[PDB]
Design a protein around this ligand. Structure first.
Ligand SMILES: OC[C@H](O)c1ccccc1
Ligand SMILES: OC[C@H](O)c1ccccc1
Ligand SMILES: OC[C@H](O)c1ccccc1
Ligand SMILES: OC[C@H](O)c1ccccc1
Ligand SMILES: [Zn+2]
Ligand SMILES: [Zn+2]
Ligand SMILES: [Zn+2]
Ligand SMILES: [Zn+2]
Ligand SMILES: [Zn+2]
Ligand SMILES: [Zn+2]
Ligand SMILES: [Zn+2]
Ligand SMILES: [Zn+2]
Lengths: 335, 332, 333, 334
C-alpha cells in the first residue's frame, strides 16, 4: 500500500510554491515515524513566507497545520503505533535544550528554521516524515482530522496566550478585535469561565463575538467602563492606538498580551507601567502539552473550530483567494 | 512634643519651601505620631520638584523615613512609644483587594497619597501616621540613617528582584546599577551578576559591591539572548534595546529607571521569544520587613552619609548638578 | 436600635442555650454593628457542640453570616449604614505578615476569634464586628440567604480548588458529595474541570450527577487507571478515603484532605516521594476569596440551594442535621 | 574504539558480576556512545544488590555517570565527539506530558529504564545513551570525578530545596546531615537561607558547623518557638522526626520528607488543614536541575568531597560500604 513516491507542494525561494508529483516517501529511521496526512490547514502565516519575504528556510513542503494517521514507525518507537491518529506541534522543538524539557518547547533555539511546513517539510503532501515523535498530540476519537488540523494553530495559539495570562473564573478580560484567532479566543477564554468583553470596529466581528459567548460587545468602550479595571487585555490587532487602550484599561498588576501583527514596534508609558506594575507578555504559537489541552477542549465541545474541506490539489486555488479577501475561519485540505 | 514644627512643603507654584509654623497633630483613634530621626533624598524628589511629576500638592516631602514613635492613639496596641520604625512608602489603605492581596504597593485608594509624595513625608520633625499598618520595626542593630535609606534604595530593587524570581542559578544583567544596593541584593539571592555602566567610577564600585562581571560594552562571548533577566536602571530607549537584545527567550526585562516617559519594544521579537516586560514599583510592607532583616544580617550594606535637615536645600542643588554620589540622609 | 436582643450562646458547660437578655453592643471607633439577616448551619457547628471541638468558650455561634450594617463607629471609612455584607469566617487581624500576605485565613492572632467559632457569631439579631476588614459586600442580585450560604459552603471548596490550581483541563476526583461540598462540584465545574465523584450513598450520587458531575461511583471500578487524577479532594478524610486519593492521584498531583475525619492520617512515604505527590492543607477561605465567591454567585456560575427558617427554630434543625443530611439551611433572626 | 569492553552487570540470580566480554554498541541515530570517565557509588545500589529493590534485571549498574562522548549517531547535532557530559538518572522518555512538562524525573514510560537502575549504567567503559536529552554538559573547570559525584549527592537535595522555594529570607530546619543532608546545607546556603541543623551524631554536627550551618543542635532548645520555620527537610524521615517538622513548621510552611525512615508516616490532620501546612514529595532531580547543579559546583558554591579508585575495585568498596566501612563518597574510573 504505502507508495514510494507522492505529490506535494514544495516551497523554494526561486519558483516559489509548486506541485511535485515525484516526491519520495522516506522510510523512518529508528526513533522516527511516517505520518499519512489526512488534513492540512492554511492561514496568513504561509502567505508571509510565499510573498512577504519571511524566511523560515528553503526547499521544503509547506503546511504547518498537520493532522493524520501514523503509517509506519521505526524500531525503538514504542509510544506510537500504526493507526494512531495524531496532530503535529508546529514549533517542532529539538526536545533536548533547556527550553524544551523546560516546558517551553515553542521557543526552542535549535528548532529554529525546522518548524513543520516552515523550515522543515510539512503537511502539503501525502506522507510526512516525523523526525521527532515527541512533537505530536493524540487526536481524540470524536475529533475529526479536519477539526484537529484546524486546532493546531487557530486554537493552539490563542489557548497558549490565554493560559499564559492565567485566566480563571474570576478573570475580567478585554479582547481587541475578533476574527483571525479572535473568535476561537472567545470560546477558549469562556472555557476558563472568565468574563469576556470585546472591542472591534468591524460590524460582523461584534455580531460573531456576541454569538461566540462574549459577555460584552462594543464598537467603542463606554465611559461607564472605569479605566484600569480589566485583569487581562489581549490585543489581536496590536497597533499603538489599540495598545494604548490596553494600558489604559488594564488594572494594576494586570497583563497586556500583544498578540497581533499590527506594527513592528510599540511604545508603552513607563511611568504608568512601573507605578501600576503592568506586565507585557510575549506569546508564540503553543507548546506540545498545550496541544493536548486544546484537543481535549475540542473533544469536549468547549471550542468549535469552524472549517471547510477541499482536496490538496486545490491549494493554489485557495492561496490566491486568501491573498485578496480571504474568508471567515480556515480551510483544510485532504491529501 | 511641641505644638508647632518646621518642615519643607512642596507646591506646584512656590516649590519646596521651609515652613517654620507647621502644626503637630496628636494621634486619634488608631493613629500614631512619628518622631522623624532620619529622612533620605533621591532623584525621585527632583522629578517632583523640577520635572513636573504631579503626586499631589501642599504636602511635606521626604519618602524615605525612619523614626521613633513619639505618641500613639487609643486602640493601638501594635506599636508603643519608643518603638523604632520605618515607613512603607506606598502607604496602602489596607482595605482593598490589592492591599489584602499581598500587593499593597499598587493600592488604588492610596495612589497619589504616598509618604512624602502626595501625603506628608519625613522632611519635618513629626509625622502623623494615619495608617500604622504601613510601618516596619527597625532592628536594634540598624541605625536610623541606614533604615531610612533602605526604605527605597534597598526596598525597590529588592521587590524587583523577587518579582523576577531571581535565584542562585540566574544569569542577570544590570544597566547603570553603579550610578546602588541592587547589586548586593541580587548577590544576596546568589545570582550571577553582570553590570553594564559607562562611568569607570561606577564600574569599580560594582566590582567592589560583588559584581561578577563589569563592562562598559558587552564583549563578544556574551551572546545575545543569554541573560535570564535584565534590569535597566537608566531606562532609555538605547538601554532598553540592549535588554531586549541580550535577554534570553522567555526572559524578563525590568525597566526600573526614571528615564524616558515612553519606551518602545520590538513586537516581533518580544512575541517570538516570549520576552516579558514587568513593571516594578517600590515595595510592599512585607518586603520592607524582609529588607530590614537582610540589612540587619549584613546581607546588604547601604552606604549612607548624613547631615542636618535644614541643609536639605543645599544638597538638593548639589544633587541636581550631580555634585555628589551615594545616598545622603537628613536628621531633623 | 434595640438595647437588648436574643441569641444562642455556646458554653462548654451548658452547651448551646437560648438567651433573651443578650446585650446590643455599640460600635466604637473602627468598629461596626451588623444586623443579621441570614445565618447558616453546618456540621462544623455539631463538632463544637457535640464533639468537644474547642474553638474557645462563651460566645454566640453561627459562622455563616450575612447582614446589613446597622451602625458604624467613627473612623469607619469603607462601610456605612445600609451596606449589605457577609462575614469572613477567619476574621484575621490584618496586621501580621500572613494577613497582609494574602492569607488572612491562617492568622495566628485570630486563632479562637473566628465569627461564631471563638468570637460572637450570627445566631443573634445584632453582631458586633471588631474588624470590618473581614467583610465582603453582597452584590445587589444576591439575597442575604444565598450570601450567608456562600460564606462556607462555597468559600471553603473554592479556596481549596483555587489552591490546587484546578483548570478546565483538570481531571479531579471528589470523595463525598452529600452536603460534604455539595457546592464543591459546582465550583469545580465553574473552573471547567472534569469531576468524578465517589460516595457510598445513592442519594449523594444522584445529587452529584445532578450537580454537574461527569462521572459518579460508589466504588471506583478497576477499569479506572491508578494515578490518573491531577487532584483529589477528600471531604470525608478517613484513612480509607485518603488511601484512595494517594492511589489514584497522578505523579506530581495533589491530595486535598479537606474533611473533618480522623485526627491523624498516614501516607505511604515511598510512593509520595517517588511520584512526587503533594498534600496541601486548606482552611476556610480568605477575604479576597469571599469577594470572588460572591461575584461568581452574582454571575450565575454557582447556584447555592438553601432553605430558610426563623432563628428560633435553630435547635429543631440542629437535631435534623444530627440524624440526616438535610444542613444548608439559613436562619433569619 | 574497542570491539569489546568490561563492566559489572547485575542479575537477580547471579548478583553483580564482572564481565570481560561485554559488547560495545554502535549508536543507531539520535543516540551516542559515552566513554565513562567517572561513575559513583551510593547506598541506592545496595538496595538493588542486597535488599531486593527491583528496578529490572540484566543491566550494567552505576547511576552516577560522568563521561566523554566517544561517538555519535546520525542526526545527532547537539553533541559531538569530545563533549564532556553527565547522565541524568531518571532518563525520561522525553515524549510524555511529564517529560514535556518539565518533570522528566517522574516519567512513567521511563520507570525501569533508569541509567544503571533498569537500563545499562556507568560501571563499564562505554555506555550507549539512547536519549541524549538526558545529559548535562560538564563545565570545563569541573573534573569528571566531581561531576559524577554531583549526579545524585547534589542533584537530589538541590531538587528538593528548589521545590520548597527557599530564598534569602527563608528560615529552614534540616534534620539529619549524614548523607545527602551534607550537600543540602551548602545548597541551601547558596539560596541565602538561614539553616538550623538537627542531628544526633556528633560528627554530623561538627560537619554541619564547618559547612556553614547557622545553628547546630543535638536536640532543639526551648528557645526555639514552635511553628517558626518556613521549611523543614527531614532526611531521616521517621515518625518522631516528622512530628518535629509538623511542630516547628510555620503556617503555610512546607515539610520535605526526603528520607527512608519508614514505609509510612502520619500527620496531624487538624494541624495541617488549620495552618495549611504542605507536604511535598521529592525524587532525584530533573535534567535542567543537573544543569543548575553543575553550575553551582562550577562556581564553587557546592563542593562535594570525593575520592577515586579503579573501577575493578568496585567489589571491595561495595562490601565496605555495605558495612559502613569507608563511608566516604567514592567514584570509579573505567
Ligand atoms: O502561532 C504561530 C504563527 O502561525 C506563525 C508561524 C510562523 C510565522 C508567523 C506566524
Ligand atoms: O519605587 C520608588 C521610587 O521612590 C519612586 C516613587 C514614586 C515615583 C517615582 C519613583
Ligand atoms: O472551613 C470552614 C469550617 O466551618 C470549619 C471551621 C472551623 C473548624 C472546622 C470546620
Ligand atoms: O535520588 C534517587 C535515589 O538514588 C534512588 C534511586 C533509586 C532507588 C532508590 C533511591
Ligand atoms: Zn497557521
Ligand atoms: Zn529544544
Ligand atoms: Zn527615594
Ligand atoms: Zn488598598
Ligand atoms: Zn459552616
Ligand atoms: Zn493576622
Ligand atoms: Zn546514587
Ligand atoms: Zn516521559
Amino acid at each position: 500500500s504505502i507508495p514510494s513516491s507522492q505529490y506535494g507542494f514544495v516551497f523554494n525561494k526561486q519558483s516559489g510554491l509548486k506541485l511535485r508529483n515525484d516526491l519520495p516517501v522516506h522510510k523512518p529511521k529508528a526513533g522516527q515515524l511516517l505520518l499519512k496526512v489526512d488534513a492540512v490547514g492554511l492561514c496568513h502565516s504561509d502567505l508571509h513566507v510565499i510573498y512577504e519575504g519571511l524566511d523560515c528556510g528553503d526547499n521544503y513542503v509547506m503546511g504547518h497545520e498537520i493532522a493524520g494517521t501514523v503509517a509506519a514507525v521505526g524500531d525503538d518507537v514504542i509510544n506510537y503505533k500504526v493507526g494512531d491518529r495524531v496532530a503535529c506541534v508546529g514549533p517542532n522543538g529539538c526536545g533536548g535544550c533547556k527550553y524544551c524539557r523546560g516546558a517551553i518547547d515553542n521557543v526552542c533555539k535549535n528548532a529554529f528554521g525546522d518548524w513543520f511546513g516552515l523550515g522543515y517539510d510539512g503537511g502539503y503532501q501525502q506522507y510526512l516524515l516525523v523526525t521527532r515523535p515527541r512533537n505530536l498530540s493524540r487526536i481524540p476519537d470524536n475529533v475529526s482530522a479536519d477539526v484537529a488540523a484546524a486546532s493546531t494553530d487557530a486554537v493552539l495559539t490563542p489557548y497558549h496566550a490565554i493560559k499564559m495570562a492565567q485566566v480563571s473564573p474570576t478573570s475580567n478580560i478585554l479582547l481587541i478585535g475578533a476574527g483571525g484567532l479572535g473568535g476561537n479566543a472567545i470560546q477558549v477564554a469562556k472555557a476558563f469561565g472568565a468574563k469576556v468583553t470585546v472591542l472591534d470596529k468591524k460590524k460582523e466581528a461584534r455580531d460573531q463575538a456576541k454569538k461566540l459567548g462574549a459577555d460584552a460587545v462594543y464598537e467603542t468602550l463606554p465611559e461607564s467602563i472605569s479605566p484600569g479595571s480589566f485583569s487581562a487585555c489581549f490585543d489581536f490587532v496590536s497597533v499603538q492606538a489599540t495598545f494604548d487602550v490596553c494600558q489604559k484599561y488594564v488594572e494594576p498588576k494586570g497583563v497586556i498580551m500583544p498578540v497581533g501583527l499590527g506594527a513592528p514596534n510599540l511604545s508603552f508609558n513607563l511611568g504608568d507601567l512601573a507605578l501600576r506594575e503592568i506586565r507585557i507578555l510575549g506569546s508564540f504559537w503553543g507548546t506540545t502539552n498545550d496541544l493536548d489541552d486544546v484537543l481535549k477542549l475540542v473533544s469536549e465541545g468547549k471550542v468549535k473550530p469552524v472549517v471547510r474541506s477541499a482536496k490538496l490539489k486545490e491549494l493554489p486555488e485557495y492561496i490566491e483567494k486568501l491573498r485578496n479577501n480571504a474568508y471567515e475561519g480556515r480551510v483544510v485540505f485532504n491529501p
